[PDB]
Amino acid sequence: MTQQIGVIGLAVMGKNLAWNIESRGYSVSVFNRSSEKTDLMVEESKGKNIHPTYSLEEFVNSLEKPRKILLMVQAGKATDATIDSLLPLLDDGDILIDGGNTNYQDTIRRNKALAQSAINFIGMGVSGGEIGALTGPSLMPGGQEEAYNKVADILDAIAAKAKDGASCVTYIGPNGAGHYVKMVHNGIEYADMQLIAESYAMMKELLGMSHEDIAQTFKDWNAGELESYLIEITGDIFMKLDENKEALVEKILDTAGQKGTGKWTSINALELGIPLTIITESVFARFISSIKEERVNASKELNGPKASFDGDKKDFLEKIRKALYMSKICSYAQGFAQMRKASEDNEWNLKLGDLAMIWREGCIIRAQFLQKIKDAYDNNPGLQNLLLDPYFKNIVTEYQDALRDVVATGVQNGVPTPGFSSSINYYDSYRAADLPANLIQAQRDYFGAHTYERKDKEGVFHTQWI
Amino acid sequence: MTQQIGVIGLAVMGKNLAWNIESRGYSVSVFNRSSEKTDLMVEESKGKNIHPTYSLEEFVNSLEKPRKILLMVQAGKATDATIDSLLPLLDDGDILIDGGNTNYQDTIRRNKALAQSAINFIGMGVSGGEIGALTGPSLMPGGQEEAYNKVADILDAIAAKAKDGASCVTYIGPNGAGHYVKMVHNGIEYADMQLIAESYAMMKELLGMSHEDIAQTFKDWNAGELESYLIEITGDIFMKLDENKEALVEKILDTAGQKGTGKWTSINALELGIPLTIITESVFARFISSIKEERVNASKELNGPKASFDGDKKDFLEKIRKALYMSKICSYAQGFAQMRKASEDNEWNLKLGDLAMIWREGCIIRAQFLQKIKDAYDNNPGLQNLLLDPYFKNIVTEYQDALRDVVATGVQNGVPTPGFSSSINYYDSYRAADLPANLIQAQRDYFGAHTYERKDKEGVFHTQWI
């Protein structure tokens, strides 16, 4: 009567994961606190190997041991309440897998406490949306390694497969490493969408392009090095019409929503001392879009230059493309630098090459560009920055001219390019042997006696400047 | 016999603060747990009304009621340990004043906790460096409003006086509003130094100016609307020769740090939803300056254009000056927008005009500039953004052309200007009635079904995009 794995939380993503697991031949028990949605799953699953349960006691007793329970409830209170109600009914060695988009510190807290009751806790990031959950997502499980290996066959079977047959799931690391990697994935996704949107702003507001010339430009870009899911769906979005046969996306209110997780990536980067300029500017860009009424008011009081481009439009579209690809490199270089630092300060022993690997398919940021990130760390596991990898170093040293032209053209024409601007400023700061921070250091010694170091001598120095 | 006020912690700032208080004719008891710092201050206080004590029991018994105790100890656990060891020894109505660089959230915890035992707690931000604490600092006290009035005589006596006679101290607001305001002061200080540092880099790397010409430029700028303490000391710093008649500022290692306190301003901005791009990139600029040996390696593998200017240098110097002023306006507009939102969220009822008033002298960011921020809020207390203030409005719509030229030239010549770039981008985003966030919303609805709102029709919408 025992089933192989259990899922709690029968909304569309818990339901789609259970069906994915069932699609691969494993017997699944399901439970939803409100039993009426379990009653819809049984009807929507007639013929599959879905054993419904209608109490936490019948659910736990329906599962083989060590019990494998996938939590797909909403984050925060409902997750901790589900864990706490489950814990008395569990035995030593059982395994809980929180699959929500949980803040990684909650996972670290839940892993530590559950470990004192001999319960394994895996915080697993899940990316791919609801269609991806049903057919093959990218999974980022972190927690006890032994617990992971006891459920690794299920994870491997349901996860997306990259073009080399590799399943888009691997053991991330201890405790909160998986949910940390999922959060950084979303931060990268914020930047990828902002850079795409800056590209659209240039095309719409500087080159005066229509939605079909915009769509076709993105489809063209998706045929080369920039091939990504996000560029691919952007091309579809500029082809969708409304009732009046006008472009629908132009009818959408330009207030970017954000359910956190993007702001978490920058908050952590600031704590770690990691310059995450590009993802953070994309978070701030969402913030300022949400004060729509304030922007409408300032547009009637603050002057600016008219957007006027008189050069070659096709040749400048190619520059925007190069600028978009190089900004992606710098943003990923920042994002992967955050993950090495978080690996170091948490002793997670993150293998950054494995993270690019599991992001080649399934997730929202999936792109052929990620195969080149894996190739970088395969050729050099000690790679300190993606900008130094021979392939990426070759791209940025040539594309920087197109990026500089795009930024300077948008700045002079009043088109905001925050992701392009911080990209070229990151490249120029990271490659600068000497920075003006020496003036900052001398100022801090002037008004605070904070001392400074020298370039030619060694030791700590303090100057009476006046 | 009995003293009027007490200071715990006799490092240079608590020591200099105690001398300040005694200089105005008040009697002060002093305590340091490490008795050596108390003995050193005993000899240095020949002929002063400084009564040393060597136990917390003795310290509390040497002050008249209601007791006024100034905590100038290490932030964090050492502050909590002292508050804990003081609590049993105090009488209802006594006043603890924590004057360290403390996280405002700790102040909220301490204030709320000490109120249950009927003890007043003032978290007070102190700005001015070690010399400012001796002569006249800027004071940002928050806490019990009537407990402030009992110490207001002393704070007013020791604070710096603006040249209209007003002391740079005022009741900021309840609980942790004082430490919050000090924290935002520092973030603003970070942006002011970075923007001065970006001007320096432009003068040196793009215009090829010597330290003599760089010093003279800052002194001329200090003579106008940019009159500021940070610009004044910068002109001095570029005049300071080393032993071999060389500009000592150039010998200083260009590493600013990764563990400053300005990062807390950005973390709070990210949680409030306030776009703090200029201060945040000033924090990030310090991070990448900290990886010196990594930057030196990248400078040997990553190329860029060689900076070269071939136009009138004096005309461009003036454009740098306008770009610096405008960027300060944009930085402060964000910083003061952050505090307005925090005052609403924490129910502090902050009076931002009185805030700019007490920053006219004593603090590090002091400048003639802050009188215009005071004038902006006195003219319009409900002002939403300083960019809308008539005086600042007139400056930015005039100076934007110089800022755009500076940013564009800087980008085309490889000179990183993260502060200048995010300023013009912030000006172009805030004034844009329509932003490309509509594509972000469309994408989020494509892969995440997060729904969207429309510019034309009202309501919430979801679309099958393909």
Author numbering:
A (entry chain A), B (entry chain B): 1 to 466
The authors write:
Attempts on direct crystallization of Ag-bound 6PGDH were not successful. Thus, we crystallized apo-6PGDH, which stands for the first crystal structure of 6PGDH from S. aureus, and then soaked the crystals into cryo-protectants containing 0.5 mM Ag+ for 2 h, allowing the protein to bind Ag+ in its packed form.
Two key enzymes, i.e., 6-phosphogluconolactonase (Pgl) and 6-phosphogluconate dehydrogenase (Gnd or 6PGDH), from oxPPP were identified as Ag+-binding proteins by LC-GE-ICP-MS. As the third enzyme in oxPPP, 6PGDH converts 6-phosphogluconate (6PG) to ribulose 5-phosphate (Ru5P) with the concomitant reduction of NADP+ to NADPH. Since oxPPP is the major NAPDH-generating pathway in S. aureus, we therefore further measured the NADPH/NADP+ ratio in S. aureus exposed to Ag+. With the recombinant 6PGDH, we show that Ag+ binds to 6PGDH and inhibits its activity in a non-competitive manner.
